Design a protein around this ligand. Sequence first.
Ligand code: U10
Ligand code: PC1
Ligand code: PLX
Ligand code: PLX
Ligand code: PEE
Ligand code: PEE
Ligand code: 3PE
Ligand code: SF4
Lengths: 98, 59, 70, 174, 156, 318, 83, 115
Amino acid sequence: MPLVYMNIIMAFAIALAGLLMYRSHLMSSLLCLEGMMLSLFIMSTLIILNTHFTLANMMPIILLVFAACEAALGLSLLVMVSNTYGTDYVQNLNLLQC
Amino acid sequence: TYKFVNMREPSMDMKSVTDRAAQTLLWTELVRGLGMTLSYLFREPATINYPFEKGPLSP
Amino acid sequence: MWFEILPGIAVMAACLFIPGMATAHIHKFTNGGKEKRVAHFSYQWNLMERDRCISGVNRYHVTKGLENID
Amino acid sequence: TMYIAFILSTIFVIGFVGFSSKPSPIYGGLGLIVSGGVGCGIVLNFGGSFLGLMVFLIYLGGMLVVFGYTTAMATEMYPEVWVSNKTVFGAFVSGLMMEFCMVYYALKEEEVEIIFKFNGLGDWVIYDTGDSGFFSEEAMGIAALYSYGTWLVIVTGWSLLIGVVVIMEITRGN
Amino acid sequence: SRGEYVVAKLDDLVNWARRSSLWPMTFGLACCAVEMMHMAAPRYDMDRFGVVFRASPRQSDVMIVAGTLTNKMAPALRKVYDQMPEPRYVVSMGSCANGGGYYHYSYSVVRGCDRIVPVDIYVPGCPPTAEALLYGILQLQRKIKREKRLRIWYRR
Amino acid sequence: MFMINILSLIIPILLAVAFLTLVERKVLGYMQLRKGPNVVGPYGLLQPIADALKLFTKEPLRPATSSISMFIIAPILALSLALTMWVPLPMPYPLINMNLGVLFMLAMSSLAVYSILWSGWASNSKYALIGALRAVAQTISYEVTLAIILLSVLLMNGSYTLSTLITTQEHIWMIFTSWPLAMMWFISTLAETNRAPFDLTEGESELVSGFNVEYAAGPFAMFFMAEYANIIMMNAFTAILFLGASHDPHTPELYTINFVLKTLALTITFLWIRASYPRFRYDQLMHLLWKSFLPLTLALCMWHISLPIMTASIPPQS
Amino acid sequence: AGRIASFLKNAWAKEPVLVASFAIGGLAIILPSLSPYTNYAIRINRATPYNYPVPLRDDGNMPDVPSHPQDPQGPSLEWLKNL
Amino acid sequence: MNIMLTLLTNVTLASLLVLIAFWLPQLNAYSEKTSPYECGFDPMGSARLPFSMKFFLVAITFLLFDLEIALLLPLPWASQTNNLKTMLTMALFLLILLAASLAYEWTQKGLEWAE
Ligand SMILES: COC1=C(OC)C(=O)C(C/C=C(\C)CC/C=C(/C)CC/C=C(\C)CC/C=C(\C)CC/C=C(\C)CC/C=C(\C)CC/C=C(\C)CC/C=C(\C)CC/C=C(\C)CCC=C(C)C)=C(C)C1=O
Ligand SMILES: CCCCCCCCCCCCCCCCCC(=O)OC[C@H](COP(=O)([O-])OCC[N+](C)(C)C)OC(=O)CCCCCCCCCCCCCCCCC
Ligand SMILES: CCCCCCCCCCCCCCCCC[C@@H](O)O[C@H](CO[C@H](O)CCCCCCCCCCCCCCC)COP(=O)(O)OCC[N+](C)(C)C
Ligand SMILES: CCCCCCCCCCCCCCCCC[C@@H](O)O[C@H](CO[C@H](O)CCCCCCCCCCCCCCC)COP(=O)(O)OCC[N+](C)(C)C
Ligand SMILES: CCCCCCCC/C=C/CCCCCCCC(=O)OC[C@H](COP(=O)(O)OCCN)OC(=O)CCCCCCC/C=C/CCCCCCCC
Ligand SMILES: CCCCCCCC/C=C\CCCCCCCC(=O)O[C@H](COC(=O)CCCCCCC/C=C/CCCCCCCC)COP(=O)(O)OCCN
Ligand SMILES: CCCCCCCCCCCCCCCCCC(=O)OC[C@H](COP(=O)(O)OCCN)OC(=O)CCCCCCCCCCCCCCCCC
Ligand code: SF4
C-alpha cells in the first residue's frame, strides 16, 4: 500500500474520533459525520481508479447519494431538537436514561 | 363623482386566455418596459453644461 | 448623445480582444507556427510522445516525413 | 514524482484534523470545504476528473445549507476558533502531531502501522503502464449506471423520494 | 530638487483621484435634501463630475449635512461621521446646517453642524439651489486640489 | 510563455472590468436621460482610473467586532475565483483546455458563493448577516436550476468541452435550437451574478449596502471587481453556449471579434435590464425558480434526453 | 369530455407553466416509442468502432467473414452514408 | 501544473492587492471608527445571536435535489451506449421521481416559508 491510502485511512480515523467525542454542539458532530463519508468516497475512488474496475466507478456516486440522505436526516433531527430546547446542545438530550 | 381605479375583470374566452398565457410564458410587458427604456436611451439628454451654462432665473 | 457611450464600449472591446488573440499567437509561436495539439485522450497523448521521440529534438511539433524515413 | 499526491493527502488530513477538533460549525465547514477541494485534487491526479469535480460540487452545495443552519440553530455569543479554546487547540495540535509523526516515519522508513503495512515509495510507481484510447474509462464506467445498474437506479430513486417524504414528516411537529 | 519634483507629481496624482471621485453618503435630513435630489436629477447631473451616492458610511468620502440637526439626531450624525474612513470632507448645506436657520432659537435644534463635525464647505440658502450646491461641490474639489500632503511630508 | 499568457488573460480582464463600470454608468445615465461621466477625461474615459486610485489610497478599516482572518480571506477568494473562471473559455483557443470544462465552471461558481457568506459573517453586523442569508437562499434556487439547464443544453452537444460547443454551433445557433432553455438560463445567470432584479445580497434599499457594509477602500474594490468579472464571464459563457460563432482555423481573429461583440451585447442587455426593472423579494425569487422554472426545466430535460434518440441525432462522444 | 375540457381551460388560465410542463413531459415519454429512428440511433451507436476489431483465426469454414476489409462480406454502412 | 500555476498567480495577485490596500494609505483608527454599523445608533443585541431560518425545509430539499442533479450529470456519456431503450427508461424514471418529489412537497406545502 502507498502512503496515500495511509493518509486517507488516517483521515477517516480522525473523523471517526471526532464524531465519538462530543463537545457541546450537535452540528459539529454532523460535520464530523459528513467528513467520514468524504474520506470513504476518496478511498473508494482511489482504489477503483487504480485497478481499472470500470463498472465500479458508479459506486462512489451512490455513496454520495446516501451520504447526503443521512445529512438531510441529521439536519431534520437537529431542527426538531432546536425547536424543542432552544439550542442544539447534546446536554439537553438527557430525558431518557439507561 | 368618482371612478374605480381597479375593478375590471378579464374575459374568459379562449383567445383572451391564450393571450394571457402567452404574456405569462413570453414576457410581453417586460419586453415593453425594455422598449421604453431603449426609447429614452435614444432620446436627447436634458443636462446643461454647468458651469458654462446656467439654468433660467427670473427678476 | 447616445454615441458618447461608444468610446467606453470601444475600450472594453479592445480589452476583450487581447486575451484571445494573445492566446492564439502564443499557441502558434510555441508550436512552430501550427495549432497547439489537443490531447484529450491517451491515444492523442501517445501520438504526441511518439512525435517528440521521432523528431530527434525533443519537440513534438517538429514534424518529419519521407525525407526522414529515406 | 514531485510528491504532489502525498502533499495533497497531508493537506486532506490537516483539514480533517481541523473540523474534527471542531472549533465551531463555521470553521468546521471551512475546513471541510478545504478537504473536499484537496480530495478533488487527489483524485484528479489519480485520474478521475468527473469524480473529483462531482465530490467538490456536492460538498460545496452541502456546506451552504450547513452555514444557514449554524447561523440559525448552532450559534453562540462567542463562536470558538482553534486558538480560542484550550480543548480545541489541544485536539488540533494532537492531530497535527500524529499526522506529522506518521509522515516522518513513512518518509524515513517503510512504516508498518499496528493495523496495515505501508511502503514508502512512488505513487507514480504504483500506477499502471497501460492506456485506453479515444474514450475515458472512468466516464464510461460512470455512464454505465443506466445501461447496467438498473437496480441501483431504482433503489437510489426510491431512497431519494422516501427521503423527501421523511424530512417532510420529521419536521411536521404538532 | 528631484525628490521635490517626484512628491509634487505624486500628490498631484493622488489629489486628482480624490477630486474626480467623490462619493457622498446617502444622508439627507430635511427640505434641503430635495435639492440634493434635483442635483442628482438629469438637469444638473452630478454623476457627470464623478459624484456618486453610496449608502454605507464606510464607502463615502463626503458628508453633505443637508437639513436641520436636532438634539435627538446629533449623536447619529457624529457616529456616521466617525464611521466614515479618512480622508473625509463635510459640506454643510442650507441655513439649518450652517447656523441655526429658521430654528436657531429652539430648544431642540443644534445651532450649526460645525458644533458636531469639522465642516469644510458652507453652502448658504434656504434651500440652496441645485446650481448653488453644485458650485459648492466644485469649490470642494478645488479645495482638494490644493492639498499637499506628500509635499508637507517631504519637508517634514 | 505560459506566464505571459496568464498575464494576457488577467490584465485585460481587469481593464475591461473598470471600463464596464464606466459603460454601465453612461448607459444608465442615457436611459435615465442624463449624460453620465463626461468630465474626468475625454468622454469620461479616466473615471475608472480615478475611482481605482481613490479607493486604493483610501484608508481601509477592520471593524472592532469582526473576525479578521475571514474578513480578509473573502475578497481574496472572490477576486481569485473571478479571475480563474476565465481560463477554460475558448476565444477560440482556451488557455487551459479541459475535458470537462463546464463542471469546472460550475464548481468554481459554487465556491465563489462562499466569499459573500464569509465576508458577511466575518463583518459581525446585522445587515451583513441578513445579506449573507439572502445569498444562501439565492444560491440554493439558482444552483439547482442552473445545473439542470446546463445538463440539457450540453446534452444537445455531446460532451462537456467548450471547443466541442464551437464545433456544434458551426452551422446554426443553440438559441435557435433551444430558446426556452436560453431564456431560463439568462434569468438564472442574472440570479447567479446578483444583478437586478435579483440584487438581494447588496440591496441598498432594504439593507445599507448589504453584505459588504463594513468593507471600505481596497477590500471593497476587490468585491466590485469580482462581481463585474463574474458579469462579463457569465455573458461570455452564454455567448459561447448559445450564440455560436464561425471559426476559421487559419485566421482565428474573426472568432475573437464575433465572440467579443456578442459578449458586449449580452453585458449591455444586463445593464438594460437593471435600468428597466424593479427588484424582486427573495422569497418571491425562491418561489419563482422552484414553482415556475423547475417544472419546465425538468420537462425540457426529459424532452432533450428523448429528442436525440427519437430523431437519431445523438452527437459524437468526442 | 366536458369535465376534461373545463379542467384544461381552468389550468391553462391559472397555471400555464404547469400545463406546458406536463405536456412536454408527456411528449418526451411517449414519442420515442413511436419514432422509427430509435433503431437507427441504436445502429449508429453500434457502428462506432471504439476498440480494435480483433481478427478471427480462419478455420476454412467462415464464408461470411471477409478476408480483407474491402471484400463484399461484412457489415455495410451504406445506409448511414445516405442518411 | 498549468492549472496550479494559474491558481497561484490569481491568489498571489489578490493577496498583493490586499497588502497594498492595507499598507499604502495613512491609517488612523479609534474606537468610534471601528464600531459596528447600525444606521448611526448602537446595536441593541449581538449579531451572533440566532437568526431564524424560515426556509429550513427548502434547504434540505435542495440537498436532495443536488444529489439528483449529480446523478443526472453523466447523461451525455450514457447516450452513447447500445442499450438506448434501457438508458432512456432509466433517465426518464429518475426525472419522473424528481418531479414526483417536487409535486409531493408542493402539495403538502413544504415550499411555504414558516410564518
Ligand atoms: C439621502 O436621500 C437621498 C438623496 O440625498 C438627499 C439623493 O440625492 C437621492 C438621488 C440618488 C439616486 C436616485 C441614486 C443614488 C443611489 C445609488 C445606489 C447610486 C446609483 C448609481 C448607479 C446605479 C450607477 C453609478 C455607478 C456606481 C454606483 C458604481 C460605483 C463605481 C465603482 C465602485 C468603481 C470602482 C471599481 C473600479 C475602478 C475597478 C477597479 C480598477 C481596475 C480593475 C483597473 C486596474 C487595471 C490594471 C491593474 C492594469 C494596469 C496594467 C496595464 C494597463 C498594462 C501593464 C502591462 C505591463 C506588461 C506592465 C436619493 C434617492 C435619496 O434617497
Ligand atoms: C508578507 C509579505 C511578504 C512579501 C511581499 C511581496 C511584495 C509586496 C508588494 C506590495 C507592497 C505594499 C506596500 C506598498 C508601499 C506603501 C506602504 C509602505 O511603504 O509600507 C512600508 C512600511 C511603512 O510603515 P508604516 O506602518 O508607518 O506605514 C505607513 C505608510 N504610509 C505613511 C505611507 C501610510 O514600512 C515598514 O513597516 C518598515 C519601515 C522600516 C522599518 C524596518 C523595521 C524592521 C523590519 C523590516 C526590515 C527588514 C529587517 C531584516 C532583519 C530582521 C531581523 C533583525
Ligand atoms: C487604475 C490602475 C492604476 C493606475 C495607476 C496610475 C496610472 C496613471 C493614472 C493616469 C493619470 C491621469 C492624470 C489625469 C490628468 C488630469 C486631467 C486634467 O484635466 O487635469 C488638470 C491637471 O491636473 C492636475 O494638475 C494634475 C493631475 C495629474 C497630473 C499627472 C500626475 C502624475 C501622472 C504620471 C504618474 C503616474 C504613474 C505613477 C504612479 C504609478 C486640471 O484640470 P481639472 O481642474 O482637474 O478639471 C476640472 C474640470 N473642468 C476643467 C471642466 C472644470
Ligand atoms: C413487480 C414485483 C413487485 C414485488 C417486488 C417489488 C420489489 C421492488 C420493485 C422492483 C422492480 C424492478 C425489479 C426488476 C429490475 C430489473 C433489472 C434488470 O434485470 O432489468 C433491466 C431492464 O430494465 C427495464 O427496462 C425496466 C426496468 C424497471 C423500470 C422501472 C420499474 C420501477 C419499479 C420500482 C419502483 C420503485 C420502488 C422500489 C422499492 C419498492 C435490464 O435490462 P437490459 O437491457 O438487459 O440491461 C442491459 C445490461 N447489459 C448491458 C449487460 C446487457
Ligand atoms: C440567450 C439570450 C436570451 C435573452 C432572453 C432575454 C429576455 C428578456 C430579458 C428581460 C427579462 C429579465 C427580467 C425578468 C425576470 C423575471 C421574468 C419572469 O418572471 O419569468 C417567469 C414567468 C412569470 O411567472 P409568474 O407570472 O410569476 O406566474 C406564476 C403563476 N403561479 O414564468 C415563466 O416561467 C416564464 C419562463 C419562460 C418559459 C419558456 C416558455 C415555454 C414555452 C414552451 C413551448 C415550447 C415547448 C417545447 C416542446 C416543443 C414540442 C414540438
Ligand atoms: C407524468 C408526465 C409528466 C412528467 C413530469 C412533468 C414535468 C415536471 C412537472 C411536474 C413538476 C411538479 C408538478 C406540481 C403539480 C402540483 C403543484 C400544485 O399544487 O399546483 C397548484 C394547483 O394548480 C393546478 O391547476 C394544478 C396544475 C394542473 C396542471 C396539469 C395539467 C395537465 C396537462 C395536460 C396536457 C394538456 C396538453 C395541452 C397543451 C397546451 C400547450 C402546451 C397551484 O399551485 P399554488 O399552490 O396555488 O401556487 C402557490 C399560490 N400561493
Ligand atoms: C518609474 C519608476 C517609478 C516611479 C514612481 C514611484 C512611486 C510610485 C508610487 C508608489 C507608492 C507610494 C510610495 C510612497 C509615497 C509617499 C507616501 C508617504 O510617505 O506619505 C506620508 C504622509 C503621511 O502623513 P505625515 O506627514 O506622516 O503625517 C502624519 C499624520 N498626522 O502622507 C500620506 O500618507 C498621504 C496619504 C496617501 C499616501 C499613499 C499614496 C501615495 C501615492 C501612491 C500613488 C500610487 C497608488 C497606487 C494604488 C494601487 C494601484 C491601483
Ligand atoms: S435651510 Fe431651509 S430648506 Fe434647508 S432644511 Fe432648513 S428650512 Fe429646510
